[PDB]
């Protein structure tokens, strides 16, 4: 709201702000000891939080050299030596909070059974890092005596932590906004170098997102980044997924539609981080339940090492199995038996049995882990796709599928259970589609189709029927939603990785009959690595053309057989003299089999095993036939196969080079090339790392998912409404806050 | 130095110093670097050859035993596919040096059952092994040059 | 040569207006400018 801000700017508020800040500073500096005013300090922390929220909301987004910015600047200038001691107190308390339990603190240990003393604490603090005279004097004054024995460091460091962190982050955001708004102001500069620790402490927790909306203006909005979210970005899994997404968008994806894919990737990565956070180390019926939950958590935590151990066991079993020998007399016909040739020790069959049982156990462990880990992601993907197809499209409402996609019918036949959005966040999807398609179609038909209950209960409440029956025993008879479980089984069995793992399971189970089927598990794990995936993908990239070329080989060899059947019959003689039943070109099928059997394995055509054409007529016809067969068949077929595979390699390398070059020369989010950001040194490096660092948008979206609308700001509410509407106009697109606003005013 | 010193015993070790200086020139460095540019992929492809030939040996051990006879008549101890290790060695020894698959040295499948199974086995072995392996090696080296 | 020709023709169709001689850089001042330029002003099939 511009009018309210303009009216409030011309008011006698800055003096009140200065008075409040001075009063608060003297509150902390005087009334902090005696350990009897915790409630007062909590109240002042809350009041300071509300005050800085008011200041931030008053500032918001504006012109880079606006009047409100100058007013705020002179308010800070008049507030010199009024917030400095507050910042110093916050910095020293944060230092105390982080130092306790960091280094040599579990190694120093004055009292193994008791606590530290005042002199001991002073000596430790002097021996520590970043401690000054007046600061340690004030800390000793604020340190409670408790007879120099009951100094509980654990209860002292965690005393005022969350409000202090919130105030520090908010004041850091405010100072960063003031620094970024005015380009050059020496007063704010020299006010800033004195207070640098409180700014550097919150350096990696300050986001930056640029929006084009809000009356066609560009402003930077700030937010908080959780520590767990920052620590979850260093896993190679997420980086590999991001690289795969970027490659898919650049190569396979088109234009003017990338941003929906970006939002989908952000949502998927948010769900992945939520699953990873849930699957963590900290995590008689109740004991059994918690033991089962802990076991499943441990199993889902370790999944990639289990596949490696399975591969190792497969190699070990295969190496052990390279000892068989077929014998007639069994030492321990149609009675040939298979036995190990050990010749050194008899501890071979027990080793094989133990390794087989261990391999089976690892196989069951990994299939249970896959069922417990990756299935929710696919379920959430399907639910999100159904929500998108039902809300903004009439695939199951306006029109109908044309009986061509079985997945469409299967996804349609789930709209009958109350527990439909099990994992999708926006539970208000049925209400949303009812409100959207409420006037054009009857409400009763929509409720019947979606399985919604009576609309009388929804429109008018009763506030009198709130039952709560006791659980007792056997509460799982109603917990099954039959239809939802059937749909889940269908979608989990139509998948690919689960089908492959099930094939692995059944092949191992069939191999438990002491056979080579364990040795048949080799390539299926040998192709499940990262660095052979590229080679196998290059081979299978031209999947159809190779099959077509093989069919062309079959057609050409067949036509050659037909044209050589009724002209050349006595030449084919694959035997010696005095043998009448030895022709291999009498039957058409046998002649075709012989021509294929030779022309696929050659290098001398067919003339290396057939009677030489002597002076018995048809000499020139036979030789021109054979030489043209050689040339056409062998040269064309081998050359096309080689050309297809070489072209596959070249196409793969070209795609990789193109995607790397495009990522190196454009901003992806913004449409400006790498030429406009060369006016300043390292301009493009800072442009894609500070303004819109790609990963910053995901952090902002995850922050926006939390912090419900009861506490949203204007910008947050606008962004949430825009995201719910799914129109994607708040993205920077053309301008990137460097032009127009900073083109002239800098 | 140490190879020359060991070669001072009047042997061929002096003649073993040839390639080590033959690859220390400027204009062969580019060709040798192009060959060794895809160092890991060639080793992986060789390992894939070993895996595929091993699986073919396993699937051909318990189905085709009387066909392998690398001798003449009136000779009982001449099977080269009885032992698993010997059969694997024979399949590697043939499938790495071929051009006629394995059918240039093994008894022809006559009308004694398993004729179609044996022929489809042999032709798919030829196609997969030889075509895939040679094509991947050629593709790797051409891609290195490019 | 075949792959190069296909890539070149696709890239040229993706970066020029064919009918007009202006490149795909002048229609970036507004969001989705080039998408609307070849779909509304001269959609090629409109001339037929
Ligand atoms: Zn940009
Ligand atoms: Zn045009």
Nearest to A320 by CA among A361, A366, A364, A358: A358
A535:B103 CB<8 A:
no
Residues 58-77 of B with CB under 8 A from A: 58-59, 61-62, 65
- CA distances A441 to A391, A444, A453, Å, are 14, 9, 17
* C29 in A contact zone (CB under 8 Å): yes
In chain B, positions 105-144, which contact chain A (CB-CB < 8 Å)?
Answer: 108, 119, 123, 126-127, 131-132, 135-136, 138-140, 142-143
What's the C19 CA to ligand 2 centre distance in angstroms? 6
DSSP state, residue C22: E
Q: Give the list of residues 6+ apart from residue B86 with CB closer than 8 angstroms, or none.
A: B80
- Token pair, residue B3, equals 């190879």
Among candidate residues A305, A385, A249, A137, the one with its CA nearest the CA of residue A658: A249
Token pair recorded at residue A92: 């020293």
- A67-78 vs A14-30: helix crossing angle, rounded to 10: 40
**How many CB pairs (< 8 A) connect A and B?**
85
Q: Using DSSP, state whether A29 is helix, strand or coil.
A: helix
Residues of A in contact with B84 (CB under 8 A): 321-325
A65: CB partners within 8 A, 6+ apart: A182, A183, A745
Two tokens, residue A655: 């795609």
Phi, psi of A470 (to 5 degrees): -70, 150
**Cα Rg, chain C, nearest whole Å:** 12
Nearest to A412 by CA among A429, A443, A389: A389
d(CA A310, CA A508): 12
C-alpha span between B146 and A646 (Å, rounded): 11
Chosen from B61, B84, B95, B133 to mutate, greatest number of chain A CBs within 10 A: B84
B127, B89 Cβ separation under 8 angstroms? no
Is the torsion defined by CA of A381, A387, A390, A391 positive or negative? negative
- CB of B48 less than 8 A from some CB of A: yes
Structure tokens at B87: 């059969």
How far is C-alpha A222 from the geometric centre of its chain's CA atoms? 24
Q: Among B51, B62, B103, select the one facing A516 at the smallest CB separation.
A: B62
What is d(CA A488, CA A527) in angstroms, rounded to the nearest whole number? 29
Find all residues with CB under 8 Å of A649, minimum gap 6, and list them: A538, B139, B140, B142, B143
> Is C42 labelled as part of a ligand binding site?
yes
Q: What number of other Cβ atoms are within 10 A of residue A684's Cβ?
A: 19
CB A480 within 8 A of CB A467: no
With H, G, I as helix, E, B as strand and everything else as coil, classify residue A605.
Answer: coil
Q: Find residue A220's DSSP bridge partners.
A: A210
Contacts of residue A733, defined as CB under 8 A and 6 or more positions apart, other chains included, come to A212, A670, A671, C31
Residues A82 and A198: their CA atoms lie apart, in Å, by: 16
- Biggest CA–CA distance in chain A, Å, is 125
What six digits make up the tokens of A266? 């952000």
What is the distance in angstroms between the CA of the first residue and the CA of the last residue of chain C? 32
Q: Which of A85, A62, A87 lies closest to A72, judged by CA?
A: A62
CA distance A622 to A606: 11
- SS3 of residue C32 by DSSP: coil
Question: Cα separations (Å) of A498 from A372, A437, A626?
Answer: 12, 37, 52
Placement of tokens 């902002």 in the chain: A700
**Chain centroid to CA A728: how far?**
22
Element (H, E) at A192: helix A186-194
Query: What's the CA gap between B115 and B107, in Å, rounded?
Result: 12
d(CA A490, CA A505): 19
A151 strand-pairing partners: A116
d(CA A167, CA A160): 11
User: Is A642 within 8 Å of B54 when comparing Cβ atoms?
Assistant: no
C17 annotated as ligand-binding: yes
**Distance (Å, whole) CA A245 – CA A261:** 9
Contacts of A672 (CB under 8 A, 6+ apart): A666, A734, A736
B66's enclosing H/E stretch is none
CA B43 to chain centre: 13
- Tell me whether strands A666-667 and C20-23 are parallel, antiparallel or unpaired: unpaired
How far apart are alpha carbons A172 and A164 in whole angstroms?
Answer: 12
Q: Alpha-carbon distance A621 to A600, whole Å?
A: 23
DSSP B91-145: HHHHHTS-SSTTTTSS----SSS-HHHHHHHHHHHIIIIIIIHHHHHHHHHHHHH
Neighbours of chain A (3+ CB pairs under 8 A): B, C
**Cβ–Cβ < 8 Å for A160, A89:** no
- Say how far residue A196 (Cα) sits from the centre of its chain: 35
Q: What is the distance between the alpha carbons of residues A17 and A243, in angstroms, rounded to a whole number?
A: 49
Interhelix angle A619-629/A543-565, nearest 10 degrees:
170
Chain B neighbours, 3+ Cβ pairs < 8 A: A
Tokens of A28: 């902390």
How many C-beta atoms surround the C-beta of residue A220 within 10 A? 16
Identify the helix (H) or strand (E) that includes residue A499: helix A497-511
- How far apart CA A150 and CA A111 sit, in angstroms, is 11
The stretches of A587-740 forming alpha helices (DSSP H) are 588-599, 619-629, 637-665, 683-686, 695-705, 714-725
- Nearest-CA neighbor of A221 among A421, A60, A426? A60
CA C37 – ligand 2 centroid, Å: 6
Say if residues A694 and A177 touch (Cβ distance below 8 Å): no
Backbone angles phi, psi at B43, to 5 degrees: -65, -40
Token pair of A55 as six digits: 């200041």
Q: Residue A449 has what DSSP assignment? A: H
CB contact under 8 A, B143 and A645: no
Q: Is A487 buried (19+), middle (13-18) or exposed (0-12) by CB count in 10 A?
A: buried
DSSP A326: E
What are the C-alpha distances in Å from A585 to residues A559, A575, B100? 14, 13, 20
Phi first, then psi: what are they for A701, rounded to 5°? Answer: -65, -40
CB atoms within 10 A of CB A602: 18
Q: What is the number of residues in chain C?
A: 48
A665, A733, A740, best to mutate vs chain C, most C CBs in 10 Å: A733
Which DSSP symbol is given to A678? Answer: G
Question: By the 8 A CB rule, do A375 and A492 touch?
Answer: yes
Note the ligand closest to the C-alpha atom of C47.
Answer: 2
- Binary contact (C31, A654; C-beta < 8 A): no
C21 and chain A in contact, CB less than 8 A:
no
CA pair distance A172, A203, nearest whole angstrom: 9
d(CA A306, CA A367): 10
At least 3 CB pairs under 8 A between chains B and C: no
Number of helices followed by number of strands (H, E) in chain B? 7, 0
Is A649 near chain B, with CB under 8 Å?
Answer: yes
For A405, phi and psi rounded to 5 degrees? -125, 110
User: Nearest ligand, CA of residue C22?
Assistant: 2
Q: CA nearest A226: which of A177, A169, A160, A159?
A: A169
Query: Which of C25, C31, C32 should be substituted to probe chain A, the one whose Cβ sees the most A Cβ atoms within 10 Å?
Result: C31
Least Cα distance to A116 among A103, A100, A129 occurs for A100
- For residue A115, give every residue at least 6 positions away whose Cβ sits within 8 Å of its Cβ, in sequence order, or none: A149, A150, A151, A152, A153
Helix H, strand E, coil C: the string for A27-92 is HHHHCCCCCCCHHHHHHHHHHHHHHHHHHHHHHCCCCCCCHHHHHHHHHHHHCCCCCHHHHHHHHH
- Residue A149: strand, helix, or coil: coil
The C-alpha atoms of residue A678 and residue A685 are separated, in whole angstroms, by 10
Q: What spacing in Å lies between the alpha carbon of A660 and ligand 2's midpoint?
A: 29
Per-residue H/E/C for A501-566: HHHHHHHHHHHCCCCCCCHHHCHHHHCCCCCCHHHHHHHHHCHHHHHHHHHHHHHHHHHHHHHHHC
DSSP state string for A125-146: HHHSSS--HHHHHHHHHHS--G
CA atoms within 13 A on the CB side of A219: 20
Pairwise CA distance, residues A222 & B112, whole Å:
81
Cα-based distances in Å from A741 to A66, A67, A683: 11, 15, 17
SS3 A671: strand
Is residue C45 classed as helix, strand or coil in its secondary structure? coil
Structure tokens at A201: 């402490």
**Distance between CA atoms of A232 and A241, rounded to whole angstroms?**
13
Please tell me which of the candidates B62, B84, B126 has its beta carbon nearest to residue A322. B84
Q: What is the resolution of this structure in A?
A: 4.0
Interface contact B139-A649, CB threshold 8 A: yes
Q: Is C38 annotated as a binding residue?
A: yes
Residue located via tokens 């300090």: A41
**Nearest C-alpha neighbor of A645 from the set A538, A732, A573, A723:** A538
Q: Is A337 helix (H, G, I), strand (E, B) or coil?
A: strand
Give the strand pairing for A337-338 and A326-327. antiparallel
Rounded to an integer, what distance in angstroms lies between the CA atom of residue B22 and that of residue A493? 60
Residue numbers after which chain A breaks, C to N beyond 2.5 angstroms: 283, 332
Q: Of all helices (H) and strands (E), which one includes residue A205?
A: none
């Amino acid at each position: 709201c511009t009018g309210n801000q303009q009216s409030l700017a011309h008011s006698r508020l800055w003096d009140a702000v200065v008075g409040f800040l001075h009063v608060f500073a003297h509150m902390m500096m005087k009334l902090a000891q005696d350990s009897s005013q915790i409630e007062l300090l909590k109240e002042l922390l809350d009041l300071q939080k509300d005050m800085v929220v008011m200041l931030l909301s008053l500032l918001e987004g504006n012109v880079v050299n606006g009047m409100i910015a100058r007013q705020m600047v002179d308010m800070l200038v008049e507030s010199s030596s009024n917030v400095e001691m507050i910042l110093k107190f916050f910095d020293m308390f944060l230092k105390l909070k982080d130092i306790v339990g960091s280094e040599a603190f579990q190694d120093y240990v004055t009292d193994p059974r008791g606590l530290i003393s005042k002199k001991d604490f002073q000596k430790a603090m002097d021996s520590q890092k970043q401690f000054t005279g007046p600061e340690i004097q004030f800390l000793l004054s604020c340190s409670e005596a408790d007879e120099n024995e009951m100094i509980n460091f654990e209860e002292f460091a965690n005393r005022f932590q969350e409000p202090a962190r919130d105030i520090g982050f908010n004041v850091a955001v405010l100072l960063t906004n003031l620094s970024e708004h005015v380009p050059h102001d020496p007063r704010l500069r020299n006010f800033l170098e004195l207070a640098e620790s409180i700014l550097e402490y919150f350096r990696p927790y300050l986001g930056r997102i640029e929006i084009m909306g809000a009356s066609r203006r560009i402003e930077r909005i700030y937010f908080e980044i959780s520590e767990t979210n920052r620590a979850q970005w260093e896993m190679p899994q997420v980086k590999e997924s991001k690289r795969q997404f970027i490659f898919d968008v650049v190569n396979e994806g088109g234009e003017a539609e990338k941003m929906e894919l970006f939002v989908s990737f952000c949502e998927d990565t948010i769900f992945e981080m939520q699953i990873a956070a849930q699957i963590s180390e900290p995590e008689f019926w109740g004991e059994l339940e918690v033991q089962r939950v802990k076991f499943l958590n441990y199993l889902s935590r370790n999944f990639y090492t289990l596949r490696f151990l399975a591969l190792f066991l497969a190699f070990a079993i295969n190496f052990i199995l390279l000892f068989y020998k077929v014998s007639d007399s069994p030492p321990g016909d149609e009675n040939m038996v298979y036995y190990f040739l050990e010749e050194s020790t008899g501890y071979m069959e027990p080793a094989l049995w133990c390794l087989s049982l261990l391999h089976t156990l690892v196989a069951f462990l990994c299939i249970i882990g896959y069922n417990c880990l990756k299935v929710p992601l696919v379920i959430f993907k399907r639910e999100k796709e159904l929500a998108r197809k039902l809300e903004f499209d009439g695939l199951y409402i306006t029109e109908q599928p044309g009986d061509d996609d079985v997945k469409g019918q299967w996804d349609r036949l789930v709209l009958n259970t109350p527990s439909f959005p099990s994992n999708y966040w926006d539970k208000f999807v049925k209400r949303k589609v009812l409100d959207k398609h409420g006037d054009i179609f009857g409400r009763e038909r929509i409720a019947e189709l979606l399985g919604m209950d009576l609309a009388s209960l929804e429109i008018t409440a009763h506030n009198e029927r709130k039952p709560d029956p006791p659980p007792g025993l056997l509460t799982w008879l109603m917990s099954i939603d039959v239809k939802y479980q059937i749909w889940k089984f269908g979608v989990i069995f139509t998948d690919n990785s689960f089908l492959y793992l099930g094939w692995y399971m059944v092949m191992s189970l069939l191999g438990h009959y002491n056979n080579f089927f364990f040795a048949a598990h080799l390539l299926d794990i040998a192709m499940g690595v990262k660095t052979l995936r590229t080679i196998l993908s290059s081979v299978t990239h031209n999947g159809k053309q190779l099959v077509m070329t093989v069919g062309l080989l079959a057609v050409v060899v067949y036509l050659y057989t037909v044209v050589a059947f009724n002209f050349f019959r006595k030449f084919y003689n694959k035997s010696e003299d005095e043998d009448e039943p030895d022709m291999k070109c009498d039957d058409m099928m046998t002649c075709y089999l012989f021509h294929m059997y030779v022309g696929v394995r050659a290098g001398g055509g067919i003339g290396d095993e057939i009677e030489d054409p002597a002076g018995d007529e048809y000499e020139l016809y036979r030789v021109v036939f054979d030489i043209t067969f050689f040339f056409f068949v062998i040269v064309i077929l081998l050359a096309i196969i080689q050309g297809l595979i070489i072209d596959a390699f070249g196409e793969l390398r070209d795609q990789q080079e193109q995607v790397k070059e495009d990522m190196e020369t454009k901003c992806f989010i913004c449409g400006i090339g790498s030429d406009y950001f060369d006016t300043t040194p390292h301009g493009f490096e800072t442009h894609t790392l500070e303004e819109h660092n790609l990963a910053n948008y995901m952090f902002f979206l995850m922050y926006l998912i939390n912090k419900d609308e009861t506490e949203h700001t204007g910008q947050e509410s606008y962004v949430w409404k825009m995201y719910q509407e799914r129109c994607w106009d708040f993205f920077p697109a053309g301008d990137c806050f460097r032009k127009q606003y900073e083109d002239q005013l800098s």
